[PDB]
Symmetry: C2
Subunit: 86 residues, 2 copies
């Protein structure tokens, strides 16, 4: 299990916006977190939230299986990092 | 934890080869496996092995932390799926 932490300073999201190729509006909500990759300190990672989801509250989390998909070359990839409480 | 299984029929690797942009030879060893992504059946996934590593033997495995890296846009990505015995 991957340990992910939302620090107190990371409790909000920001929103970026634009227009798709054929005219549709979009909005993306982004939140920061720390992921422990086994180095001397955790590293900073950007999360893009799913539609209608609030920012994750401060605390400890692990990664949900729905984060993964098989990519177009047949290898496993991360689609979007989706979290669940630890 | 991600459940990965090497079936008896997947106990070997194949090798692809070529030459890099500035003349260096390379060889890549590839092995297949099944990864349970929570659908009705596990899905087929291609693994690229690291230099000097044998094919994983048949059995159950989970994913090592070294599989992950922060990508050039700041989000988490899979570098290469690296496995450890379950």
């Amino acid at each position: 299990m991957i340990k992910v932490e939302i620090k107190p300073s990371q409790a909000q999201f920001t929103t970026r916006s634009g227009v798709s190729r054929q005219g549709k509006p979009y909005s993306l909500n982004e939140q920061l977190c720390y992921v422990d990759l086994g180095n001397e300190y955790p590293v900073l990672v950007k999360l893009t939230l799913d539609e209608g989801q609030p920012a994750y509250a401060p605390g400890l989390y692990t990664v949900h299986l729905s984060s993964f998909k098989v990519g177009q070359f047949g290898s496993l990839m991360i689609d979007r990092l989706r979290l669940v409480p630890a």
